[PDB]
Design a protein around this ligand. Structure first.
Ligand code: SF4
Ligand SMILES: [Zn+2]
Ligand SMILES: [Zn+2]
Lengths: 103, 752, 42, 131, 98, 42
């Protein structure tokens, strides 16, 4: 139930990935099913902070291509726009989740 | 890149080019070589502006004739967009050639958008901004300050700093968009408006609105300062005829005539005071009027007439003043009795439609006023206002309207009409009569453009049908073609909704706006699309009153309550500042993923010029076909005139106008071939007009997609937004939808 | 009122009233008499 | 006043059948009822205070322009242009002579309007119309 | 505040309604924190004021806000401005130190 | 009457005038409540 918030989830992800060491790559995987997000603050500042802390975000959306998720994936993956994945059917979700386990 | 079209090197500012841009470039170069006029349709999404500017600059530079370039747009926003694309093109040309060549690119607009004076900036009207700038920069203020340094008159330092530098030393070489020009003139403490108005003749390329080429009130300097053999480009010209109407129309109310009487009384008091004090300032003007000196021969170049010339410069008489209005008091009495005749013509109980010749004949029979003093009335009023040196001219302002009227209906006799209505609006209890002098012939304003210039390039995104415009505007075209955009996958999904979810027919006719059932259908449709739309909606309504009614019924019932859960509701307001703030808030809400819906009207401010590229336009919801209000006498008179002269049917022209407005609303949304978005049209009358749509939208509109309901429209939108989000194969679009350099050379060799 | 409009003086009154203006039968369920409720409306 | 006839004092709400009638000579606002009252017996002086010029009942008319001075201007224009009927063809295409003739006739119309030098201009008009 | 049309036949509450005009005060202060210059890409005030001397055909009652029998506005432009102001307030509330 | 004719006048009666009454004294012999009767078609 409720109305999802990308910024709160990304802020707790940033907090959780603060104490991990620098040799360990910090990654965030988001299974975002909605099409709109409600944020308590500016999400572009959160994207800037995620880029500045070298956190890579890959988002597997469920319905369509949301702009903020695409911009977040493009910014946190050094310009690569291929980290925003939208599925087709039941088997493509297995394909995406099996692709996601590779480093 | 850098490629070749015949003997012309074109510097394209991107590493890749679309095939439609190359065909556009070939046709433009062929048109400029052979001469004559042309009408071209570039589908949106493609870089129409950048390709057009690229070949036009290359054609100017490489050929030794060095023809100047006129880029007319329909709005200031697209003027700024064209200047930004010009900045990118010129930066690429400088980078490729290694040097900054001799180039001048300046945009033109009113003083209100080019004023840096800290006091006259917050005025919501451009008329008072122009008036204050004239008062502080007429040159009379400068000489009164020189004669009396202790006077209370003030000068603008931004204008006075321009006298210390030469014309070629105003700005450095290059291009200057309004943001960069405003920043440079703020840092250098200069006035950008006078810089542009004095560098009109020195510019290689200049971009201004249609009015500066069509409205003769402000075109009298711009058309003179531009060379005759220049390239002329009309960008988004599909509405240009309406601009022609706005060039040569005027409205007078009872309040306007009362203010005209007050201004006439103030002029009488002022002329009595001046006659009491100093009669030489009238005697010199009188003796200058004896020999036959006109307004331009007496007024200097640095000062302008108080009332603008409202007719074409070719239709102004070169003969002397007839002498009925030569004396100041005689002209005051002439103007006063003309105003009282108009006030007498106001009192009527039925709508009177009549020709200018009948108006002049009835005017002459009722009072002794001839056509010849009327044809010089505006020039005489401007001369009288100049020679009196009145400091405050606000109570004269509405008086200018009368002079405009006195110059319009007197000089032309064919193709215009006068409509006198006892009711301005039907719902008012008190009668409020209005008088509309109306342009019916759209070709009379644009005829000097086609006769003065040798070759024009009419280009709009969604101008259809192509052959309507050479009939509606009296000019010939050497070539007409509308390109079909080539796609690896269907980028845009035009859909037509004729019935709602419960298979009830839906429409946007004005008399059925109160029907609950179509409100139910539109509400359920908009809620479902807003539930499925990813980023941001643009919704276009046929009228603002219809918009008010449908929003009130949605808010009373609770339709908007479900919309508020997903997307923020943002509304166009008649106040331009609030509408611009709502537009910026809509863009910000689309950017951060909150989601927003922009409810606007198809014939308003938002539908023209403003783009909805990428995430700002994931859905275009066209609520109903945008017909005008048919029972208005202006539209019926124009339809009758076009039926008489241009043999166009009334219903055909109404369908053409509604479909061109809906077409530009659909065409505002694509920029780039990766861009996607559905174009849903919610009316039962759209499906019969599929041939009147632009051919790229038509070929994107499949035959199975004419008579959808709501539910399977939602399913089709779901499937389309699921498929468009996938990463496309670069092999599937490597040489069919976009071209590299080697693909362009291969296609050139295959064509040879 | 009908002559005030003829004299050109608009009346502020509506037209007054002088102007023209507008079984029981047997019951077979005798072992449950009184438990059934009347329903004269839906 | 604007609404009421100052002579019979009747208002428009009470009497909606009153009409705007005016003397061409002295230009006083009056209604048709007062015209049928005082001037039906014969010629008399103007019932306004401070005005006593002789005026006739048959000369009465309605003001089209609704402003007194503009009616004065247009009626002097009618009174002058009946015999001042020269056109550009009468001057055989001479624009400057026709322009000075227009200036002179506008000057005499202005002089009959303000009455500053009404005597010699009226005498000139009479001598011109006698020809 | 919901956006409904205000009617005079409703009683309301005689305690809260004294704040009503004060809330209207807040609305102009809302304009005082919302009216800022925008870019020239979407400058519609420059769209209307591209030339100040447009005196063409006046837009008819379909292109103008609706009015009652006396000629004053019906008040749906008030709720349009209210929902625009609410959306603007929601977007501008995100611009903070959070 | 210029303001009256430009305004709308409602037709009042005894029942309408009963909605805006002011008490003349403490004890009134005449009752102000209307008593309807059957068969009156005045
Ligand atoms: S000269 Fe320029 S800056 Fe000065 S008042 Fe005029 S428009 Fe504004
Ligand atoms: Zn009288
Ligand atoms: Zn008198």
């Amino acid at each position: 139930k409720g109305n999802p918030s990308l910024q709160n989830a990304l802020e707790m992800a940033r907090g959780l990935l603060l104490p991990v060491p620098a040799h360990c790559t910090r990654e965030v995987l988001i299974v975002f099913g909605s099409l709109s997000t409600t944020d308590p603050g500016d999400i572009h500042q959160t994207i800037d902070s995620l880029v500045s802390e070298k956190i890579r975000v890959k988002v597997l959306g469920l319905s369509a291509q949301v702009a903020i998720c695409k911009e977040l994936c493009k910014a946190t993956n050094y310009g690569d726009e291929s980290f925003y994945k939208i599925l087709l059917d039941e088997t493509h979700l297995k394909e995406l989740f099996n692709e996601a386990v590779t480093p | 890149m850098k490629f070749y079209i015949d003997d012309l090197p074109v510097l394209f500012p991107y590493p890749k080019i679309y095939p439609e841009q190359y065909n556009y470039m070939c046709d433009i170069k062929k048109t400029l070589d052979v001469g004559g006029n042309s009408i071209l349709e570039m589908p949106s999404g493609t870089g129409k502006t950048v390709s057009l500017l690229s070949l036009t600059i290359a054609y100017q530079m490489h050929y030794p004739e060095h023809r100047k370039i006129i880029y007319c747009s329909r709005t200031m926003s697209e003027i700024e967009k064209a200047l930004v694309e010009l900045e990118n093109l010129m930066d690429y040309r400088t980078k490729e050639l290694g040097y900054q060549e001799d180039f001048r690119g300046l945009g033109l607009t009113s003083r209100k958008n080019l004023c840096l004076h800290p006091e006259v900036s917050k005025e919501r009207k451009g008329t008072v901004v122009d008036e204050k700038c004239r008062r502080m920069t007429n040159g009379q203020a400068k000489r009164k300050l020189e004669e009396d340094p202790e006077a209370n008159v003030e000068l603008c330092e931004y204008h006075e700093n321009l006298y210390n530098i030469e014309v070629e030393d105003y700005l450095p070489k290059g291009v200057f968009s309004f943001e960069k020009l405003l920043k440079y003139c703020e840092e250098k403490t200069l006035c950008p408006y006078f810089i542009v108005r004095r560098m009109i003749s020195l510019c290689n390329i200049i971009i201004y609105s249609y009015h500066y080429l069509l409205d003769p009130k402000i075109a009298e300097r711009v058309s003179n300062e531009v060379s005759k053999d220049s390239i002329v480009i009309f960008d988004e010209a599909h509405n240009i005829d309406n601009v022609c109407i706005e060039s040569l129309s005027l409205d007078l109310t009872t309040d306007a005539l009362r203010r005209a009487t007050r201004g006439a009384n103030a002029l009488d008091e002022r002329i009595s005071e001046v006659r009491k004090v100093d009669s030489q300032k009238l005697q010199d003007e009188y003796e200058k009027l004896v020999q036959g000196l006109h307004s331009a021969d007496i007024l200097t170049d640095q000062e302008e007439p108080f009332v603008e010339t409202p007719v074409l410069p070719q239709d102004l008489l070169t003969e002397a003043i007839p002498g009925n209005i030569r004396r100041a008091e005689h002209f005051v009495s002439f103007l006063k009795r003309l105003i009282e005749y108009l006030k007498t013509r106001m009192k009527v109980l039925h709508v009177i439609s009549e020709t200018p010749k009948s108006f002049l004949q009835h005017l002459k029979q009722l009072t002794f006023i001839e056509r010849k003093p009327l044809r010089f009335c505006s020039e005489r009023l401007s001369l009288l206002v100049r020679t009196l040196e009145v400091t405050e001219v606000e109570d004269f302002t509405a008086l200018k309207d009368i002079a405009t009227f006195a110059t319009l209906i007197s000089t032309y006799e064919e193709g215009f009409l006068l409509i006198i209505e006892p009711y301005e609006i039907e719902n008012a209890a008190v009668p409020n009569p209005i008088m509309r002098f109306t342009c019916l012939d759209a070709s009379i304003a644009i005829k000097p453009v086609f006769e003065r210039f040798s070759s024009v390039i009419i280009t709009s995104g969604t101008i259809s049908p192509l052959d309507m415009y050479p009939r509606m505007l009296n000019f010939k075209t050497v070539l007409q073609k509308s390109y079909a955009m080539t796609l690896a996958k269907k980028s845009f999904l035009p859909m037509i909704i004729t019935k709602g979810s419960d298979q009830v027919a839906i429409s946007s006719r004005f008399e059925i706006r109160n029907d609950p059932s179509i409100v139910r259908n539109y509400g359920s449709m908009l809620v479902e699309f807003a539930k499925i739309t990813p980023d941001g909606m643009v919704v276009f309504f046929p009228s603002y009153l219809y918009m008010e009614s449908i929003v009130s019924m949605w808010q009373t019932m609770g339709i908007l309550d479900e919309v508020w859960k997903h997307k923020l509701i943002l509304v166009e307001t008649p106040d331009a500042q609030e509408t611009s703030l709502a537009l910026e808030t809509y863009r910000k809400a689309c950017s951060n993923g909150r989601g927003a819906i922009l409810l606007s009207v198809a014939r308003g401010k938002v539908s023209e010029g403003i783009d909805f590229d990428h995430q700002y336009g994931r859905t275009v919801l066209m609520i109903g076909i945008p017909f005008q209000y048919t029972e208005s006498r202006i539209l019926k008179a124009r339809l009758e005139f076009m039926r008489e002269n241009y043999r166009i049917r009334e219903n055909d022209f109404l369908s053409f106008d509604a479909m061109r407005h809906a077409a530009q609303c659909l065409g505002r949304v694509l920029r780039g071939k990766d861009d996607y978005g559905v174009m849903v049209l919610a009316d039962r009358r759209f499906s019969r007009k599929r041939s009147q749509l632009p051919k790229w939208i038509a070929q994107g509109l499949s035959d199975a997609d004419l008579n959808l309901s709501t539910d399977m429209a939602i399913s089709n939108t779901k499937q389309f937004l699921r498929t468009m989000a996938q990463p496309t194969d670069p092999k599937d679009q490597e040489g069919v939808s976009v071209w590299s350099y080697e693909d362009l050379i291969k296609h050139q060799n295959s064509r040879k | 009122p009908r002559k005030l409009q003829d004299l050109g003086l608009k009346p502020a009154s509506v037209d007054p009233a002088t102007i023209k203006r507008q079984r029981k039968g047997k019951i077979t369920n005798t072992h449950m008499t009184g438990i059934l409720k009347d329903y004269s409306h839906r | 006043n604007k609404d009421m006839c100052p002579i019979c004092k009747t208002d428009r709400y009470l009497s909606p059948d009153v009409k705007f009638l005016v003397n061409p000579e002295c230009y006083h606002r009056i209604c048709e009822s007062c015209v049928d009252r005082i001037f039906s017996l014969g010629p008399a002086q103007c019932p306004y205070k401070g005005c006593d010029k002789i005026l006739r009942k048959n000369k009465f008319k309605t003001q089209i322009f609704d402003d007194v001075e503009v009616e004065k201007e247009v009626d002097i224009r009618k009174r002058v242009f009946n015999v001042f009927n020269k056109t550009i063809d009468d001057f055989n295409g001479d624009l400057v002579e026709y322009n000075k003739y227009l200036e002179e006739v506008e000057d005499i119309i202005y002089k009959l309007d303000h009455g500053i030098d009404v005597a010699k201009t009226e005498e000139k008009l009479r001598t011109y119309e006698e020809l | 505040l919901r956006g409904e049309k205000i009617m005079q036949n409703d009683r309301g509450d005689v305690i809260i309604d004294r704040y009503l005009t004060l809330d209207q005060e807040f609305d102009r202060k809302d304009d005082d924190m919302l009216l800022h210059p925008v870019k020239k890409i979407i400058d519609l005030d420059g769209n209307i004021q591209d030339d100040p001397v447009v005196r063409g055909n006046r837009p008819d009652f379909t292109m103008q806000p609706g009015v009652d029998i006396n000629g004053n506005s019906d008040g749906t432009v008030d709720i349009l401005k209210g929902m625009n102001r609410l959306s603007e307030k929601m977007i501008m509330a995100l611009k903070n130190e959070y | 009457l210029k303001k009256i004719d430009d305004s709308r006048i409602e037709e009042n009666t005894f029942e309408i005038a009963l909605a805006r009454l002011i008490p003349p004294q403490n004890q009134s012999h005449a009752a102000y409540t209307y008593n309807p009767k059957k068969g009156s078609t005045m």
